[PDB]
């Protein structure tokens, strides 16, 4: 009763109030597009002749992704984002339940390792052509978690050896205000913070000097709408910090995820709090109306986009958890329409059947790797009730072996590291434990259109399968 | 016909370096003859760290083919600095890129670095250009964030005059007149009126602000932007919702509403306002009932969320 189907709801345009604008022109036009596609399509929940079947065309999407061979020349516009092309593919294939043979995996590992600079960090291409960058670094580390292993050719061994260099790269990126440059001379925003914190958490290279002000930079990104902007500006430690743009689906995902990762760090008065209830509110307000397929939009008064199913939808359980903790500080139905979102994916976000395959921004747009990956990532979050379980974190604390682990990182500043071995080990335990604290609630599963639509469970915050996240992070914390 | 750089006299002295992504790499791209050749020589240029005019020209060749090549952009700016090139000339080049590139992080950051280094005494000319830049795409996130940085940076240097701020607010007002649904413009207004360090906060500045917000809502009652701004406003300044309620109540069926054509009632956000009003009065039971109506009828997409709010009352 709390996750009604789009088909069971009245489809009505956004009212004009007799004041037309450019925004409203696009909104209506887009409303017609999605609305008509839904009309052509059979209701996924029913048991209709001549109407299109909305079933998840998994084999088409797999073939769309097969294009592990070579990309058309027009992909030069992403020559600096090849690790993303790898991640979008190997992660989508993981969600679609399609395995790569060992030979193909080795290729993936070898390719990425060629993007690794000895000075530290991954670039968007071969190290002899591109400099390290926080984004390709995240995409590469994550891809190695999916396609690699712990053999001499698995890649994980190479990461472990590069830990000190990657850390030193991270420090060169660090600004005093708590922000990071995405690369040497590069821009500064929560994308970099997110990608950096994810890798530092997974590879066990987190230090106090790494985190200073990082929390303040993120809190200050939150706007009046409740979501988070790309960055915050520090007026000269700083007198005050101001958000620099609109609350944005992507940047809100990066902000929520970053802040969440910080909450498990054993520092005092760290991290600076955010307004969890305002983040949740902004999140749920971004889900479209029935007429627009109940897909997510990334900004107020802009169009729904399939890729935001992950950026916005995937942030919901992180915000929901932060709200939960908020209420426990002083002292259940779903928080967004888990049904409508799946319907948007199945009906509107999939490529027309019998064609190239792949998922897309919206009807009228060409499918691509990026939207394929994010549409399915969101679909996962909607199909599977994800929760951060304290009892599971507690269970993780009990089984954690502090005697095992890779060599501590050497801080840039003498006092940059943890006060002592005890503080460091308690920090290792907390970070590791909480990182493995996400569970799929049993009985919480909802699979619109039948079990043949089911895809695998992705982890919030990290966005790789739990069965990847566990063996991977366990390797670097030597908890195997 | 293309002339390979290997046959160019100006480059005869350079030994090009092939791309090294190993054997049988995944996600390989079918580069054009031009692109591959340029990168082949860039690899050699950057490897030897040559700071020259030809290196500079090469970077323009590359970034034109791939506006997102962050590595090449980084090398280019280090060339501008090293060769002590005219940053003004480079700024005019960036005006060509800003035309068709639009959403490239590397283009925008490059422009930011330029203006940081140039550090003009008066950024008025750049401010103007940004405004003009927004005509083709009034919601370009990169652009808005850049304008935020420009005013924040140069105001920290004390170079934003009161006349400058005043005209900016005029321009913002004009943006919202042309499209009151432009949430980017609303965000800018928040910066100008609220968040910026030098914002005027008086018991009469608030008056004007409410007047503006309310009239905006009455012109377009279903505008999510205006409603969010209204709530963020009251919340930021810790103002009570109750007193302003008479202007919102009509939408649950100081400036007051008219009613405009094509204006279905009730407005869900007006109901949220009413519900939170009850909470402000400690009438949790009356708040629950409107939360329940949002969940059941008036905003069913968020049935679960409004159900959560309804329980939050109990």
């Amino acid at each position: 009763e709390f996750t009604p189907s789009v088909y069971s709801l009245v489809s009505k345009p956004l009212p004009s109030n007799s004041r037309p604008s450019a925004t409203l022109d696009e909104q209506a036009e887009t409303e017609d597009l999605i609305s008509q596609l839904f009309d052509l399509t059979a209701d996924p929940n029913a048991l209709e002749h001549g109407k299109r079947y909305s079933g998840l065309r998994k084999q088409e999407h797999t073939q769309f992704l097969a294009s592990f061979f070579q990309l058309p020349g027009k992909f030069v516009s992403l020559d600096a984002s090849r690790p993303w092309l790898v991640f979008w593919t190997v992660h989508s294939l993981d969600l679609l339940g399609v395995a790569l043979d060992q030979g193909t995996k080795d290729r993936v590992v070898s390719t990425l390792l060629h993007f690794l600079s000895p000075k530290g960090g991954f670039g968007g291409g071969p190290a002899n052509s591109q400099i390290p960058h926080l984004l390709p670094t995240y995409a590469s580390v994550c891809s190695l978690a999916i396609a690699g292993n712990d053999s001499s050719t698995g890649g994980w061994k190479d990461l472990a050896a590069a830990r000190q260099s990657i850390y030193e790269f991270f420090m060169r990126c660090k600004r005093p205000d708590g922000g990071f440059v995405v690369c040497e001379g590069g821009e500064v925003d929560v994308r970099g913070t997110y990608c950096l914190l994810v890798v530092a958490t997974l590879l066990d290279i987190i230090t106090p000097e790494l985190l200073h002000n990082v929390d303040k930079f993120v809190s200050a990104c939150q706007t009046y709408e409740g979501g988070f902007a790309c960055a915050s500006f520090p007026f000269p430690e700083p007198s005050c910090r101001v958000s620099m743009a609109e609350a944005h689906g992507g940047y809100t995902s990066c902000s929520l995820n970053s802040h969440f990762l910080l909450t498990s760090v054993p520092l005092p008065s760290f991290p600076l709090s955010i307004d969890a209830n305002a983040a949740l509110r902004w999140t749920v307000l971004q889900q479209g109306e029935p007429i627009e397929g109940g897909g997510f939009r990334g900004r107020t008064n802009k169009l729904v986009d399939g890729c935001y199913s992950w950026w916005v939808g995937g942030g919901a359980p992180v915000a929901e958890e932060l709200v939960r903790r908020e209420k426990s500080r002083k002292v259940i139905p779903p928080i967004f329409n888990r049904v409508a979102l799946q319907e948007f994916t199945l009906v509107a976000a999939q490529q027309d059947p019998g064609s190239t395959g792949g998922l897309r921004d919206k009807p009228g747009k060409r499918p691509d790797q990026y939207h394929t990956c994010n549409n399915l990532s969101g679909l996962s979050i909607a199909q599977h009730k994800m929760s951060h379980s304290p009892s599971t974190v507690s269970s993780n604390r009990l089984k954690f072996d502090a005697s095992k682990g890779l060599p501590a990182v050497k801080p840039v500043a003498p006092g940059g590291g943890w006060k002592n071995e005890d503080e460091r080990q308690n920090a290792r335990r907390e970070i590791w434990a909480n990182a493995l604290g996400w569970i799929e609630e049993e009985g919480g599963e909802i699979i619109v259109g039948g079990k043949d639509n089911r895809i695998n469970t992705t982890t919030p915050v990290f966005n790789i399968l739990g069965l990847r996240l566990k063996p991977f992070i366990n390797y670097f914390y030597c908890q195997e | 016909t293309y002339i390979p750089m290997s046959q160019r006299r100006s480059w005869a002295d350079v030994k090009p370096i092939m791309q090294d992504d190993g054997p049988n790499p995944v996600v390989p791209i079918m580069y054009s003859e031009e692109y591959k050749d340029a990168m082949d020589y860039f690899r050699a240029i950057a490897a030897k760290e040559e700071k020259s005019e030809r290196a500079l020209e090469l970077t323009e060749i590359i970034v034109r083919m791939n506006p997102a090549h962050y590595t090449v952009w980084q090398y280019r700016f280090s060339l501008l600095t090293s060769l002590n090139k005219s940053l003004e000339d480079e700024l005019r080049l960036m005006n060509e890129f800003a035309v068709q590139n639009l959403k490239s992080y590397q283009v925008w950051h490059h422009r930011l670095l330029l203006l940081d280094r140039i550090s003009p005494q008066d950024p008025v000319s750049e401010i103007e250009y940004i405004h003009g830049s927004l005509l083709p795409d009034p919601k370009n996130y990169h652009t808005w964030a850049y304008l935020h940085w420009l005013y924040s940076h140069f105001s920290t240097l004390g170079r934003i005059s009161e006349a400058q701020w005043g005209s900016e607010l005029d321009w913002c007002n004009e943006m919202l007149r042309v499209d009151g649904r432009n949430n980017s413009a609303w965000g800018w207004r928040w910066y100008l009126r609220v968040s910026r360090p030098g914002a005027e906060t008086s018991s009469r500045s608030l008056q004007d602000e409410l007047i503006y917000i309310l009239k905006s809502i009455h012109l377009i009652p279903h505008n999510v932007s205006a409603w969010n701004y209204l709530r963020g406003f009251l919340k930021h300044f810790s103002l009570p919702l109750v007193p302003i309620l008479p202007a919102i109540l009509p939408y649950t069926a100081f400036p007051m509403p008219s009613l405009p054509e094509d204006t279905p009632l009730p407005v869900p956000l007006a109901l949220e306002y009413l519900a939170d009003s009850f909470i402000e009065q400690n009438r949790v039971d009356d708040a629950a009932k409107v939360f329940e109506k949002l969940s059941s009828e008036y905003d069913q997409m968020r049935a679960g969320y409004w159900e959560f709010r309804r329980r939050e009352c109990a």
Binding site: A80, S81, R191, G250, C307, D361, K365, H371 | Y70, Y105
Partner: peptide, 9 residues
């Protein structure tokens, strides 16, 4: 069917 304008890097 035009391409989507979604850059993340």
């Amino acid at each position: 069917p035009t391409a989507s304008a979604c850059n993340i890097q």
